[PDB]
Amino acid sequence: ASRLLLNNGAKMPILGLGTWKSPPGQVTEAVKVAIDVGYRHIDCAHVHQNENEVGVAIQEKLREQVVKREELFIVSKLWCTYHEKGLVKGACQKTLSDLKLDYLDLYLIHWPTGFKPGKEFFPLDESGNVVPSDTNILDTWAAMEELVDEGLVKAIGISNFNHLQVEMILNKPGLKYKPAVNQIECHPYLTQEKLIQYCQSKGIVVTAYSPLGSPDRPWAKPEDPSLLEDPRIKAIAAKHNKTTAQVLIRFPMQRNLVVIPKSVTPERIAENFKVFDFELSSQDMTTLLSYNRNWRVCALLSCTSHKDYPFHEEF
């Protein structure tokens, strides 16, 4: 539809606006335009370093009465340097301050990896490697569950968890709140059929991040594949008189995924909204799926020997 049902009874807008890499001085206007255009779901994160400026736009549209607060679906995520039981509430409350809300709709564990606490997002040792916390996924999940019981967040979820990491929360003794959502990377070059099949079979909603292949990721190099300019995908968009981005956004939606394309450009924020009015044939969907090449934009490459690195498992 336009919203999917979560295991807590709330409904989550199938389209949201991503805000990673959105400069603090453009994102306020970006979020204001999104909300005006009809977006009702914004994907945030403390590590983005722009939640204060996202929060300025949200407050403005609330006070303008363009939207009521219960119409909005705001998501953020707990960064890896706050996995300690004693740090989780404090990280949540900081995010709530910057965003200027009194609760979140969904709050995700950003990565399954815990890092040493401190002021660096990626703490390094003598030899320049990332310093891990000795915390585990289950301790952190218990801290998250508390935030539901105190009324700070309505739902809790995970991001970049492999199927065995999800299983481990699912089999936790005394598990009180199931993960509502697993936000993972997903597009025609990394189609994630096994992990999406698993999560959907557990009643867990999947959100596809980097739908367009994150052409603005910091580590981009030119040999790299570009979805937005794949001549095969352009042909499919030509056939529907749509843009290739509009096709890349409609693709997850028809797999019953939530999708969160990022833009700070007003015409593109608008273009990206115009995806509810057409449909890919099953032939187009199969063709799109056949393009997989197991290519990840985000492989958290500095943590490949972390005890909790998610991407050594098949899925």
Q: Interface with ligand NAP by CB under 6 A: which range of 18-26, 97-105, 125-133, 287-295?
A: 18-26
Q: What is the DSSP string of 42-107?
A: EE--GGGS-HHHHHHHHHHHHHHTSS-GGG-EEEEEE-GGG-STTTHHHHHHHHHHHHT-S-EEEE
Q: Which residue is nearest to ligand NAP (CB)?
A: 18
Taking CA atoms, 255 is separated from 111, 113, 278, in Å, by: 24, 28, 14
Site string for ligand NAP, 151-180 (x = CB under 6 A): --------xx--------------------
Q: Interface with ligand NAP by CB under 6 A: which range of 85-93, 258-266, 273-281, 284-292?
A: 258-266
Q: Interface with ligand NAP by CB under 6 A: which range of 12-20, 137-145, 168-176, 190-198?
A: 12-20
Residue listed under structure tokens 């706050």: 82
Check binding of 19 to ligand NAP (CB under 6 A): yes
Residues 236-255 that bind ligand NAP (CB under 6 A): 243, 245
Taking CA atoms, 97 is separated from 31, 80, 93, 312, in Å, by: 17, 19, 6, 36
Find the binder of ligand NAP among 298, 299, 311, 315 (CB under 6 A). 298
Write out the two tokens for 116: 């040493």
List the one residue out of 201, 226, 231, 205 whose CA is nearest residue 215. Answer: 226
- Please, after which residues is the chain broken with C–N above 2.5 Å? none
# binding residues, ligand NAP (CB under 6 A): 31
Check binding of 183 to ligand NAP (CB under 6 A): yes
List the one residue out of 2, 1, 6, 4 whose CA is nearest residue 154. Answer: 6
For 248, the enclosing helix (H) or strand (E) is helix 244-253
List the one residue out of 121, 109, 99 whose CA is nearest residue 147. Answer: 109
Closest CB to ligand NAP among residues 92, 260: 260
Backbone φ and ψ for 15, nearest 5 degrees, come out as -110, 130
Q: CA 11, CA 113: separation in Å to the nearest integer?
A: 29
Check binding of 18 to ligand NAP (CB under 6 A): yes
Check binding of 21 to ligand NAP (CB under 6 A): yes
Q: Interface with ligand NAP by CB under 6 A: which range of 19-27, 147-155, 163-171, 188-196?
A: 19-27
Site string for ligand NAP, 191-220 (x = CB under 6 A): ------------------xxxxxxxxx---
Closest CB to ligand NAP among residues 64, 271: 271
Sites of contact with ligand NAP (CB under 6 A):
18-21, 43, 110, 159-160, 183, 209-217, 228, 243, 245, 260-265, 268, 271-272, 298
